[PDB]
Amino acid sequence: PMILGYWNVRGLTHPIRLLLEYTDSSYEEKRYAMGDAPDYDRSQWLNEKFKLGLDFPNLPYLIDGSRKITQSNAIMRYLARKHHLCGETEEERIRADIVENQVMDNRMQLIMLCYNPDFEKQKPEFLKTIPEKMKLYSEFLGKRPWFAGDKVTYVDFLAYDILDQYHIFEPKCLDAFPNLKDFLARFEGLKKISAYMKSSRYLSTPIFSKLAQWSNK
Amino acid sequence: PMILGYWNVRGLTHPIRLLLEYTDSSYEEKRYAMGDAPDYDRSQWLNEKFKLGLDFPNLPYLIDGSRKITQSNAIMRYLARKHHLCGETEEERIRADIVENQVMDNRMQLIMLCYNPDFEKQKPEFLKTIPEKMKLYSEFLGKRPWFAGDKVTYVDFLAYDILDQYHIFEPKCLDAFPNLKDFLARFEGLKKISAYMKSSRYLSTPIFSKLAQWSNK
Ligand SMILES: N[C@@H](CCC(=O)N[C@@H](CS[C@H]1c2ccccc2-c2ccccc2[C@@H]1O)C(=O)NCC(=O)O)C(=O)O
Numbered sequence: 223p224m225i226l227g228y229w230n231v232r233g234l235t236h237p238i239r240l241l242l243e244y245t246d247s248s249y250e251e252k253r254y255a256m257g258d259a260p261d262y263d264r265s266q267w268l269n270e271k272f273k274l275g276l277d278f279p280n281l282p283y284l285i286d287g288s289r290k291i292t293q294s295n296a297i298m299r300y301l302a303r304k305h306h307l308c309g310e311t312e313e314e315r316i317r318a319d320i321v322e323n324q325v326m327d328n329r330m331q332l333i334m335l336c337y338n339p340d341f342e343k344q345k346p347e348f349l350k351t352i353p354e355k356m357k358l359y360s361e362f363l364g365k366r367p368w369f370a371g372d373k374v375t376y377v378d379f380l381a382y383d384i385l386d387q388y389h390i391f392e393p394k395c396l397d398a399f400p401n402l403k404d405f406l407a408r409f410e411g412l413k414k415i416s417a418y419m420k421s422s423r424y425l426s427t428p429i430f431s432k433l434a435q436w437s438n439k
Numbered sequence: 440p441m442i443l444g445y446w447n448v449r450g451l452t453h454p455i456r457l458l459l460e461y462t463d464s465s466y467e468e469k470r471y472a473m474g475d476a477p478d479y480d481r482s483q484w485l486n487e488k489f490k491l492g493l494d495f496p497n498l499p500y501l502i503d504g505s506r507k508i509t510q511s512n513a514i515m516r517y518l519a520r521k522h523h524l525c526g527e528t529e530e531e532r533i534r535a536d537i538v539e540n541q542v543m544d545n546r547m548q549l550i551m552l553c554y555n556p557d558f559e560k561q562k563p564e565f566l567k568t569i570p571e572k573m574k575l576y577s578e579f580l581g582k583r584p585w586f587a588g589d590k591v592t593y594v595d596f597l598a599y600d601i602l603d604q605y606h607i608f609e610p611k612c613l614d615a616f617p618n619l620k621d622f623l624a625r626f627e628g629l630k631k632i633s634a635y636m637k638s639s640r641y642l643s644t645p646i647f648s649k650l651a652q653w654s655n656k
């Protein structure tokens with residue numbers, strides 16, 4: 223089968239796991255464990271990082287026969303193309319391209335805060351900026367059932383993850399935006415998704431590694 | 440014409456400015472200036488940030504007729520589709536996907552170092568990791584004239600910019616990798632590119648804002 227490698231956390235891999243499941247892909251995972259503080263041992267991965275034939279070794283990685291991929295968005299795009307989950311028009315492509323990138327920025331902002339030793343004092347300033355982020359997603363989606371338009375695309379997998387993550391962080395953050403709450407429900411309502419969420423493989427939390435100040439255990 | 444919005448520095452926008460020239464695009468740029476310390480006034484952008492009708496306001500932005508794009512990578516892909524500078528086979532698409540994302544990683548690394556108050560302390564250690572970074576681009580490229588294959592694609596402009604920036608930071612970094620030096624020369628050799636580099640519109644430095652510890656003026 224295909225092989226997915228990543229840490230034994232949700233991290234930035236959720237969308238891939240979700241996409242593999244929604245597609246009925248035959249895959250096996252390799253979930254690498256990181257030790258606890260203070261050394262945070264990474265040996266399980268480091269022992270093989272340069273032994274898998276990857277061009278730019280990293281986690282996550284996807285091995286599909288002869289094809290070896292790294293960079294989470296590249297993996298998302300490989301599986302999208304294989305299953306026709308890319309935009310079909312120029313308008314759908316542009317919306318997908320922007321959301322892919324926007325998701326990574328809002329993911330980077332969360333990471334920055336959750337790895338900061340000054341987390342508890344930084345937190346208040348971060349919470350103030352949430353409503354603006356959610357507003358932009360809300361206005362972007364509008365009345366469409368999905369981010370790219372009329373049909374589910376690989377970018378709905380990205381968007382679901384980051385909205386979900388922010389919602390775990392600040393549970394009241396979507397109260398003001400009904401179309402976002404509805405989007406989450408719709409996504410989770412997808413049969414393959416609904417199924418997966420009750421499976422032994424589902425890994426919602428922790429989000430971050432042991433080094434983080436939040437969702438780290 | 441098209442409008443490219445960004446700060447009056449090279450930043451992360453060199454690939455876009457270079458692709459606009461390579462494609463003989465009809466464009467004008469709005470180069471916003473940031474005030475000096477202590478406040479580093481951003482008002483020139485901030486007064487119009489939410490009045491341009493951008494979905495997710497940011498810099499750079501591209502206005503092309505009725506289309507308004509943000510996210511540098513989304514601007515690059517939009518131009519590539521526009522001008523047929525994408526990969527044409529699955530193989531080339533995967534190569535492009537990986538590079539695009541790899542370049543961003545390598546950029547974020549340089550950025551993180553450059554905006555660290557402790558830059559001088561940190562530099563020496565950073566320099567030791569360059570060779571390994573350069574070696575992966577070297578082996579990836581191999582004997583190919585361009586990163587995705589036989590034809591120039593948008594990812595070449597991305598690759599050019601990050602190898603150029605690493606070379607400014609450490610002038611000896613490419614000596615061990617002739618294929619990378621040859622690539623820089625081949626890229627710079629593209630006719631429209633040569634002409635641009637001698638023009639009044641070229642902006643190779645500074646790379647960063649005044650907030651940075653290197654290439655900040
Ligand atoms: N742009 C690339 C970035 C690839 C990348 O940086 N990989 C990290 C793992 S991903 C990151 C992360 C991002 C968000 C939330 C959590 C995590 C995380 C969780 C547990 C442990 C390490 C992490 C990390 O903080 C990794 O550990 N790499 C192997 C190595 O360096 O040898 C991508 O999109 O795919």
Ligand SMILES: N[C@@H](CCC(=O)N[C@@H](CS[C@H]1c2ccccc2-c2ccccc2[C@@H]1O)C(=O)NCC(=O)O)C(=O)O
Nearest residue numbers: 327446448450451497498499510511512550646647648
């Ligand atoms: N993922 C996105 C990110 C877009 C984004 O972060 N934009 C920054 C400018 S770009 C960044 C930069 C990155 C690399 C090198 C230099 C810079 C830089 C230079 C001058 C002044 C500000 C910067 C920055 O540190 C900005 O100022 N945004 C408008 C605002 O927030 O209101 C992209 O790829 O497009």
